[PDB]
Amino acid sequence: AAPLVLVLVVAVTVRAALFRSSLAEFISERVEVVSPLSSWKRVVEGLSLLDLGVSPYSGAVFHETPLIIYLFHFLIDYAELVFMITDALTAIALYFAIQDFNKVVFKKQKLLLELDQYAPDVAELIRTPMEMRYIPLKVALFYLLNPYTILSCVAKSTCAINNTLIAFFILTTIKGSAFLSAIFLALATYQSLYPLTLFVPGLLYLLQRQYIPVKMKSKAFWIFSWEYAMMYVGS
Amino acid sequence: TRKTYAIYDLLDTAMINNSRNLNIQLKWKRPPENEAPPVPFLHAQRYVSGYGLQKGELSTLLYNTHPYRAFPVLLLDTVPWYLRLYVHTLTITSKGKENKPSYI
Ligand SMILES: CC(C)CCC[C@@H](C)[C@H]1CC[C@H]2[C@@H]3CC=C4C[C@@H](OC(=O)CCC(=O)O)CC[C@]4(C)[C@H]3CC[C@]12C
Ligand SMILES: CC(C)CCC[C@@H](C)[C@H]1CC[C@H]2[C@@H]3CC=C4C[C@@H](O)CC[C@]4(C)[C@H]3CC[C@]12C
Ligand SMILES: CC(C)CCC[C@@H](C)[C@H]1CC[C@H]2[C@@H]3CC=C4C[C@@H](O)CC[C@]4(C)[C@H]3CC[C@]12C
Ligand SMILES: *[C@@H]1O[C@H](CO)[C@@H](O)[C@H](O)[C@H]1NC(C)=O
């Protein structure tokens, strides 16, 4: 409890300290950190073009979705706070998802033990409750204190919002809600095209949580798959 | 400005005939520093700012040397596609204050 709050405080302090230094302008222009689809300067250019009466998409500099336009239209003044909030959000979502997943793993591994489908001498390969205690806190720390993430945050790159959407997809999937999972996957596919490939793994996890067998001669499998696909495409 | 011109009429046969042609001569040297004409009321310059091969700026300077009158100017610029421009960085400053164009 206290460790997570302390980690969050340290991460926010480092980001706030780097926002006020003389390296922010240098960081904001790195070709390793921003792209034609992520730069903040292109955001402000599009907003200015709208106020000059020109369509933002009539040139060659602005390649952002309209939802980004809406959001930053209403929050251009508070830009530096938004990115801190988003990074904290993705860290917290990953933390809780990992907690639930560890519970499932230990319970699944424990169930196999009595069906005695494991070899006689396989120990020291068995998971134990004492080692899985600090995995989620570590995961949060590895995301928040990675220099790549701090660099992305100080540059105000749009990639942070994409990462947040993916993390929320994972959280909602592991918690077992298909409607929210489809919504968040659709929002991730809307921003960048490639996340559509994560459709199959989430469907497999949901089917495994329902205890539905995955076979070609099954009826529940096809019904569940059809409903999930329809929700995603409609979104 | 009031200017005076000397006229040589080539169709006059007092000026040019079969037996005599025309060669005009003119005495002129750079005048002293005093008595030199004043500079024109309008002139301009253009240059590139920065260094490197990634980013830069295009700058123009416009001069008004008239003692008491202000007048408007119309400016036309064309730039190739390879030098991508960011229009939210456009600034026009006179005497340290911002000048807002009437038409753009
Ligand atoms: C392979 C291509 C055309 C992609 C689309 C997949 C279809 C081939 C799927 C969609 C629905 C499936 C059917 C859904 C339900 C059944 C019933 C199933 O048998 C039972 O339900 C019997 C119940 C019992 O007696 O226990 C046999 C397979 C079958 C015909 C499935 C065969 C494969 C189908 C046609
Ligand atoms: C409101 C918007 C802006 C942001 C939402 C962030 C907060 C409210 C969300 C994000 C992830 C969420 C957590 C995800 C998973 C679980 C596990 C579940 O067994 C109890 C609730 C709990 C612990 C959730 C509580 C609320 C939570 C912390
Ligand atoms: C604009 C941003 C914030 C998105 C907000 C949530 C979006 C994704 C919501 C709003 C209305 C929703 C749709 C409402 C009704 C249906 C019909 C149902 O049979 C499948 C899901 C589907 C198609 C929903 C998909 C998700 C949806 C499109
Ligand atoms: C030009 O030629 C005519 C005819 O020879 C001559 O009378 C005249 O004097 C010449 N030019 C001059 C000096 O006017």
Coordinates of C-alpha atoms and ligand atoms in Angstrom, one line a residue:
Chain A
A1 CA 0.0 0.0 0.0
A2 CA 2.6 2.5 1.2
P3 CA 5.1 1.3 -1.4
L4 CA 2.8 2.0 -4.3
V5 CA 2.1 5.6 -3.1
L6 CA 5.8 6.2 -2.5
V7 CA 6.6 5.0 -6.0
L8 CA 4.0 7.3 -7.5
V9 CA 5.3 10.3 -5.5
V10 CA 8.8 9.7 -6.6
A11 CA 7.8 9.3 -10.3
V12 CA 5.7 12.5 -10.2
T13 CA 8.5 14.4 -8.5
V14 CA 11.1 13.4 -11.1
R15 CA 8.7 14.4 -14.0
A16 CA 7.9 17.7 -12.4
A17 CA 11.6 18.5 -11.8
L18 CA 12.4 17.7 -15.4
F19 CA 9.6 19.8 -16.8
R20 CA 11.1 23.0 -15.3
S21 CA 14.7 22.6 -16.4
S22 CA 16.6 23.8 -19.5
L23 CA 16.5 20.3 -21.1
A24 CA 12.8 20.2 -21.9
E25 CA 13.2 21.9 -25.3
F26 CA 16.2 19.6 -26.1
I27 CA 14.1 16.5 -25.2
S28 CA 11.0 17.7 -27.1
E29 CA 12.8 17.4 -30.5
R30 CA 14.5 14.0 -30.4
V31 CA 13.8 11.8 -33.4
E32 CA 14.0 8.8 -31.1
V33 CA 11.2 10.2 -28.9
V34 CA 8.7 11.8 -31.2
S35 CA 7.3 10.9 -34.7
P36 CA 5.1 12.5 -37.4
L37 CA 2.2 10.9 -35.5
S38 CA 3.2 11.9 -32.0
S39 CA 4.7 15.4 -31.9
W40 CA 3.1 18.1 -29.7
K41 CA 4.1 20.9 -32.1
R42 CA 1.9 19.3 -34.8
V43 CA -1.0 19.4 -32.3
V44 CA -0.6 23.1 -31.8
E45 CA -0.1 23.6 -35.6
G46 CA -3.4 21.9 -36.3
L47 CA -5.2 23.9 -33.7
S48 CA -3.9 27.2 -35.2
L49 CA -4.9 26.1 -38.7
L50 CA -8.4 25.6 -37.5
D51 CA -8.4 29.2 -36.2
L52 CA -7.2 30.5 -39.6
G53 CA -10.1 28.9 -41.4
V54 CA -8.1 26.1 -43.0
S55 CA -8.8 22.4 -42.6
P56 CA -6.0 20.7 -40.6
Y57 CA -5.8 17.8 -43.0
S58 CA -5.3 20.0 -46.1
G59 CA -1.5 20.1 -45.6
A60 CA 1.3 17.6 -44.9
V61 CA 2.2 18.3 -41.2
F62 CA -0.8 17.2 -39.1
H63 CA -1.8 13.5 -38.8
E64 CA -3.9 13.2 -35.6
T65 CA -7.3 11.9 -34.9
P66 CA -10.2 14.2 -34.2
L67 CA -10.6 13.0 -30.6
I68 CA -7.1 14.3 -29.8
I69 CA -8.3 17.7 -31.3
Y70 CA -11.3 17.7 -29.0
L71 CA -9.4 16.8 -25.9
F72 CA -6.5 19.3 -26.4
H73 CA -8.9 22.0 -27.5
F74 CA -10.4 21.8 -24.1
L75 CA -7.1 21.2 -22.2
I76 CA -4.3 23.1 -24.0
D77 CA -3.5 25.1 -20.8
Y78 CA -3.2 22.2 -18.5
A79 CA -1.1 20.0 -20.9
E80 CA 1.7 19.1 -18.4
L81 CA -0.8 17.7 -15.8
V82 CA -2.6 15.5 -18.3
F83 CA 0.5 13.4 -19.1
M84 CA 1.4 12.8 -15.4
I85 CA -2.2 11.7 -14.8
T86 CA -2.1 9.3 -17.8
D87 CA 1.3 7.7 -16.7
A88 CA 0.0 7.2 -13.2
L89 CA -3.2 5.6 -14.6
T90 CA -1.4 3.1 -16.7
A91 CA 0.9 2.1 -13.8
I92 CA -2.1 1.5 -11.5
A93 CA -4.0 -0.5 -14.0
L94 CA -1.0 -2.8 -14.6
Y95 CA -0.6 -3.2 -10.8
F96 CA -4.1 -4.5 -10.2
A97 CA -4.2 -6.7 -13.4
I98 CA -1.0 -8.4 -12.2
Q99 CA -2.5 -9.1 -8.8
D100 CA -5.5 -10.8 -10.2
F101 CA -3.4 -12.8 -12.7
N102 CA -1.1 -14.1 -10.0
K103 CA -4.1 -15.3 -8.0
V104 CA -5.4 -17.3 -11.1
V105 CA -1.9 -18.8 -11.8
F106 CA -1.4 -20.0 -8.2
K107 CA -4.9 -21.4 -8.0
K108 CA -4.5 -23.2 -11.5
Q109 CA -1.1 -24.6 -10.5
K110 CA -2.5 -25.7 -7.1
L111 CA -5.4 -27.6 -8.8
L112 CA -3.0 -29.6 -11.1
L113 CA -1.0 -30.8 -8.0
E114 CA -3.8 -33.1 -6.8
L115 CA -4.6 -34.3 -10.3
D116 CA -0.9 -35.4 -10.0
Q117 CA -0.1 -34.7 -13.6
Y118 CA 3.4 -33.4 -12.7
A119 CA 6.6 -35.4 -12.6
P120 CA 7.8 -36.8 -9.2
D121 CA 11.0 -34.8 -8.8
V122 CA 9.9 -31.4 -10.2
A123 CA 10.2 -29.1 -7.2
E124 CA 12.1 -25.8 -7.1
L125 CA 10.1 -25.2 -10.3
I126 CA 6.9 -24.8 -8.2
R127 CA 5.5 -21.2 -7.6
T128 CA 5.3 -20.2 -4.0
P129 CA 3.3 -17.4 -2.4
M130 CA 6.4 -15.7 -0.9
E131 CA 7.9 -15.0 -4.4
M132 CA 4.8 -13.7 -6.1
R133 CA 4.2 -11.0 -3.4
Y134 CA 6.1 -8.1 -4.9
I135 CA 5.7 -8.8 -8.6
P136 CA 2.9 -6.1 -9.2
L137 CA 4.8 -3.4 -7.3
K138 CA 7.9 -4.2 -9.4
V139 CA 5.9 -4.0 -12.6
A140 CA 4.6 -0.6 -11.7
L141 CA 8.2 0.6 -10.9
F142 CA 9.7 -0.8 -14.1
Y143 CA 7.1 1.1 -16.1
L144 CA 7.3 4.4 -14.1
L145 CA 11.1 4.7 -13.6
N146 CA 12.1 3.6 -17.1
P147 CA 14.0 6.4 -18.8
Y148 CA 12.1 5.8 -22.0
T149 CA 8.8 6.6 -20.2
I150 CA 10.1 9.7 -18.5
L151 CA 11.5 11.0 -21.9
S152 CA 8.2 10.4 -23.5
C153 CA 6.3 12.2 -20.8
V154 CA 8.5 15.3 -20.8
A155 CA 8.2 15.6 -24.6
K156 CA 4.3 15.4 -24.3
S157 CA 4.2 12.6 -26.9
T158 CA 0.7 11.1 -27.7
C159 CA 2.1 7.6 -27.3
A160 CA 1.4 7.8 -23.6
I161 CA -2.4 7.9 -24.2
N162 CA -2.1 4.8 -26.4
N163 CA -0.2 2.9 -23.7
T164 CA -2.9 3.9 -21.2
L165 CA -5.6 2.6 -23.5
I166 CA -3.8 -0.8 -23.9
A167 CA -3.3 -1.1 -20.1
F168 CA -7.0 -0.5 -19.5
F169 CA -7.8 -3.1 -22.1
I170 CA -5.7 -5.6 -20.2
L171 CA -7.2 -4.6 -16.8
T172 CA -10.8 -4.9 -18.1
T173 CA -10.1 -8.2 -19.8
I174 CA -8.5 -9.9 -16.8
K175 CA -11.3 -8.6 -14.6
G176 CA -13.7 -10.4 -16.9
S177 CA -15.8 -7.8 -18.6
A178 CA -16.1 -8.2 -22.4
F179 CA -18.1 -5.1 -23.2
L180 CA -15.5 -2.7 -21.7
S181 CA -12.7 -4.9 -23.2
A182 CA -14.2 -4.5 -26.7
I183 CA -14.6 -0.7 -26.2
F184 CA -11.0 -0.2 -25.1
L185 CA -9.6 -2.4 -27.9
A186 CA -11.7 -0.3 -30.4
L187 CA -10.3 2.9 -29.0
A188 CA -6.8 1.5 -29.3
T189 CA -7.4 0.4 -32.9
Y190 CA -8.9 3.8 -33.7
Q191 CA -5.7 5.6 -32.7
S192 CA -3.2 3.2 -34.2
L193 CA -4.0 0.4 -36.6
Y194 CA -1.9 -2.4 -35.4
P195 CA -3.5 -3.2 -32.0
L196 CA -6.2 -5.2 -33.8
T197 CA -3.9 -8.2 -33.5
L198 CA -4.6 -8.4 -29.7
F199 CA -8.2 -9.5 -30.5
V200 CA -7.3 -13.3 -30.4
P201 CA -5.5 -13.4 -27.0
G202 CA -8.2 -11.5 -25.1
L203 CA -10.9 -13.8 -26.6
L204 CA -8.9 -16.8 -25.6
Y205 CA -8.5 -15.6 -22.0
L206 CA -12.2 -14.8 -21.7
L207 CA -13.2 -18.2 -23.0
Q208 CA -10.8 -19.8 -20.6
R209 CA -12.3 -17.8 -17.7
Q210 CA -15.8 -19.0 -18.6
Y211 CA -14.6 -22.7 -18.6
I212 CA -15.8 -23.0 -22.2
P213 CA -13.9 -25.6 -24.2
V214 CA -12.3 -24.5 -27.4
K215 CA -13.2 -27.0 -30.0
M216 CA -14.5 -27.0 -33.6
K217 CA -17.6 -29.1 -32.6
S218 CA -18.7 -26.8 -29.7
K219 CA -21.7 -24.5 -29.5
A220 CA -20.8 -22.1 -26.6
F221 CA -17.5 -21.3 -28.3
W222 CA -19.1 -20.0 -31.5
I223 CA -21.8 -18.0 -29.8
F224 CA -19.3 -16.3 -27.4
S225 CA -16.9 -15.5 -30.3
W226 CA -19.7 -14.0 -32.4
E227 CA -21.0 -11.8 -29.6
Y228 CA -17.5 -10.5 -28.9
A229 CA -16.7 -9.8 -32.5
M230 CA -20.0 -8.0 -33.0
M231 CA -19.4 -5.7 -30.0
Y232 CA -15.8 -4.8 -31.2
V233 CA -16.9 -4.0 -34.8
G234 CA -19.9 -2.0 -33.7
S235 CA -17.6 0.0 -31.4
Chain B
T1 CA 10.7 64.5 -57.2
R2 CA 11.4 67.4 -59.6
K3 CA 13.9 66.1 -62.1
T4 CA 15.6 67.9 -65.1
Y5 CA 16.5 66.1 -68.3
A6 CA 18.5 67.1 -71.4
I7 CA 17.0 66.0 -74.7
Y8 CA 18.9 65.0 -77.8
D9 CA 16.5 64.6 -80.7
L10 CA 18.0 62.2 -83.2
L11 CA 15.5 63.1 -86.0
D12 CA 16.9 66.7 -86.1
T13 CA 19.4 67.3 -88.8
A14 CA 21.1 69.9 -86.7
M15 CA 22.0 67.1 -84.3
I16 CA 22.9 64.2 -86.6
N17 CA 23.8 64.3 -90.3
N18 CA 25.7 62.2 -92.8
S19 CA 29.0 64.0 -92.1
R20 CA 28.9 64.0 -88.3
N21 CA 27.8 61.5 -85.6
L22 CA 26.9 61.9 -81.9
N23 CA 29.0 61.1 -78.8
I24 CA 27.6 62.4 -75.5
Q25 CA 29.9 63.1 -72.5
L26 CA 29.0 63.4 -68.9
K27 CA 31.1 64.5 -65.8
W28 CA 30.0 62.6 -62.7
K29 CA 31.9 61.4 -59.5
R30 CA 30.6 60.2 -56.2
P31 CA 29.4 63.3 -54.3
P32 CA 30.9 64.1 -50.9
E33 CA 29.4 62.6 -47.8
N34 CA 27.6 65.9 -47.2
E35 CA 25.2 66.8 -50.1
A36 CA 24.4 63.1 -50.8
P37 CA 20.8 62.4 -51.4
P38 CA 18.8 60.9 -48.5
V39 CA 18.0 57.1 -48.6
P40 CA 14.6 56.0 -50.0
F41 CA 11.6 55.7 -47.8
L42 CA 11.3 51.9 -48.2
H43 CA 13.8 49.1 -48.4
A44 CA 14.0 45.5 -47.2
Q45 CA 16.3 42.5 -46.5
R46 CA 15.9 38.7 -46.1
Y47 CA 18.1 36.1 -44.4
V48 CA 18.1 32.6 -42.9
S49 CA 18.6 32.1 -39.1
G50 CA 20.1 29.1 -37.3
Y51 CA 22.6 26.4 -38.0
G52 CA 22.6 22.7 -38.7
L53 CA 20.6 20.5 -41.1
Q54 CA 17.4 20.0 -39.1
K55 CA 15.5 23.3 -38.3
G56 CA 15.7 27.0 -39.1
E57 CA 13.9 30.2 -39.5
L58 CA 13.2 32.7 -42.4
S59 CA 13.4 36.4 -41.5
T60 CA 12.5 39.6 -43.3
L61 CA 13.3 43.2 -42.3
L62 CA 11.2 46.1 -43.5
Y63 CA 12.3 49.8 -43.1
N64 CA 10.2 53.0 -43.0
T65 CA 12.6 56.0 -43.0
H66 CA 9.9 58.7 -43.4
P67 CA 10.0 61.2 -40.5
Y68 CA 6.2 61.3 -39.7
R69 CA 4.1 59.2 -42.1
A70 CA 3.0 55.5 -41.8
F71 CA 2.0 53.5 -44.9
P72 CA 0.8 50.0 -45.6
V73 CA 2.6 47.2 -47.5
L74 CA 1.5 43.9 -49.1
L75 CA 3.9 41.0 -48.8
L76 CA 3.9 37.8 -50.9
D77 CA 6.1 34.7 -50.1
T78 CA 6.3 31.3 -51.8
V79 CA 8.2 28.4 -50.3
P80 CA 8.9 24.9 -51.7
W81 CA 7.3 21.8 -50.2
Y82 CA 10.5 20.3 -48.8
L83 CA 10.9 23.1 -46.3
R84 CA 7.9 22.4 -44.1
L85 CA 6.5 25.5 -42.4
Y86 CA 4.8 25.8 -39.0
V87 CA 2.3 28.7 -39.1
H88 CA 1.8 28.9 -35.4
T89 CA 5.3 30.3 -35.1
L90 CA 4.7 33.4 -37.3
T91 CA 5.6 36.6 -35.6
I92 CA 5.5 40.3 -36.7
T93 CA 7.1 42.8 -34.4
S94 CA 7.5 46.6 -34.7
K95 CA 9.6 48.6 -32.2
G96 CA 9.4 45.7 -29.7
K97 CA 5.6 45.4 -29.9
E98 CA 3.4 42.9 -31.8
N99 CA 1.8 44.1 -35.1
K100 CA -1.5 42.4 -36.1
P101 CA -1.9 42.2 -39.9
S102 CA -5.2 43.4 -41.4
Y103 CA -5.4 40.7 -44.0
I104 CA -3.7 37.2 -44.2
Ligands
LIG1 C1 -15.0 -22.4 -41.3 C2 -15.5 -21.1 -41.9 C3 -16.8 -21.3 -42.6 C4 -15.7 -20.1 -40.8 C5 -17.0 -20.1 -40.0 C6 -17.1 -21.2 -39.0 C7 -18.2 -22.2 -39.3 C8 -17.7 -23.4 -40.1 C9 -18.9 -22.6 -37.9 C10 -19.9 -21.5 -37.4 C11 -20.9 -22.3 -36.6 C12 -20.4 -23.7 -36.5 C13 -21.4 -24.8 -36.1 C14 -22.1 -24.5 -34.8 C15 -22.7 -25.7 -34.1 C16 -22.5 -27.0 -34.5 C17 -23.2 -28.1 -33.8 C18 -22.2 -29.2 -33.4 O1 -23.0 -30.3 -32.8 C19 -23.8 -30.0 -31.8 O2 -24.0 -28.9 -31.4 C20 -24.4 -31.3 -31.3 C21 -24.9 -31.2 -29.8 C22 -24.9 -32.5 -29.1 O3 -25.6 -33.4 -29.5 O4 -24.2 -32.6 -28.1 C23 -21.4 -29.7 -34.6 C24 -20.7 -28.5 -35.3 C25 -21.6 -27.4 -35.7 C26 -22.4 -27.8 -36.9 C27 -20.6 -26.1 -36.1 C28 -19.8 -26.4 -37.3 C29 -18.9 -25.2 -37.7 C30 -19.7 -23.9 -37.9 C31 -20.7 -24.0 -39.0
LIG2 C1 -12.1 7.5 -13.5 C2 -11.0 7.4 -14.5 C3 -10.6 8.8 -15.0 C4 -9.8 6.6 -14.0 C5 -10.1 5.3 -13.3 C6 -9.0 4.9 -12.3 C7 -9.4 4.1 -11.1 C8 -10.7 4.7 -10.5 C9 -9.6 2.6 -11.5 C10 -8.5 2.2 -12.5 C11 -8.2 0.7 -12.2 C12 -9.3 0.3 -11.2 C13 -9.1 -1.0 -10.4 C14 -8.9 -2.2 -11.3 C15 -9.1 -3.5 -10.7 C16 -9.7 -3.7 -9.5 C17 -9.8 -5.1 -8.9 C18 -11.2 -5.3 -8.4 O1 -11.3 -6.6 -7.7 C19 -11.6 -4.2 -7.4 C20 -11.5 -2.9 -8.0 C21 -10.1 -2.5 -8.6 C22 -9.1 -2.3 -7.5 C23 -10.3 -1.2 -9.5 C24 -10.6 0.0 -8.6 C25 -10.7 1.3 -9.5 C26 -9.5 1.5 -10.3 C27 -8.2 1.8 -9.4
LIG3 C1 -16.1 8.3 -28.2 C2 -15.4 7.4 -27.3 C3 -15.2 8.0 -25.9 C4 -16.0 6.0 -27.2 C5 -17.2 5.9 -26.2 C6 -17.7 4.5 -26.1 C7 -18.2 3.9 -27.4 C8 -17.1 3.0 -28.0 C9 -19.5 3.2 -27.3 C10 -20.7 4.1 -27.3 C11 -21.9 3.4 -27.9 C12 -21.4 1.9 -27.9 C13 -22.2 0.9 -28.8 C14 -23.7 0.9 -28.3 C15 -24.4 -0.4 -28.8 C16 -23.8 -1.5 -29.3 C17 -24.6 -2.7 -29.8 C18 -24.1 -4.0 -29.2 O1 -24.8 -5.1 -29.7 C19 -22.6 -4.1 -29.5 C20 -21.8 -3.0 -28.9 C21 -22.3 -1.6 -29.5 C22 -21.9 -1.4 -30.9 C23 -21.6 -0.5 -28.6 C24 -20.0 -0.4 -28.8 C25 -19.3 0.7 -28.0 C26 -19.9 2.0 -28.2 C27 -19.7 2.5 -29.7
LIG4 C1 25.4 68.5 -91.2 O1 25.5 68.4 -92.6 C2 25.0 69.6 -93.3 C3 25.1 69.4 -94.8 O2 26.4 69.1 -95.1 C4 25.7 70.8 -92.8 O3 25.2 72.0 -93.5 C5 25.6 71.0 -91.3 O4 26.4 72.1 -90.9 C6 26.1 69.7 -90.7 N1 26.0 69.8 -89.2 C7 26.0 70.9 -88.5 C8 27.4 71.3 -88.1 O5 25.0 71.5 -88.3

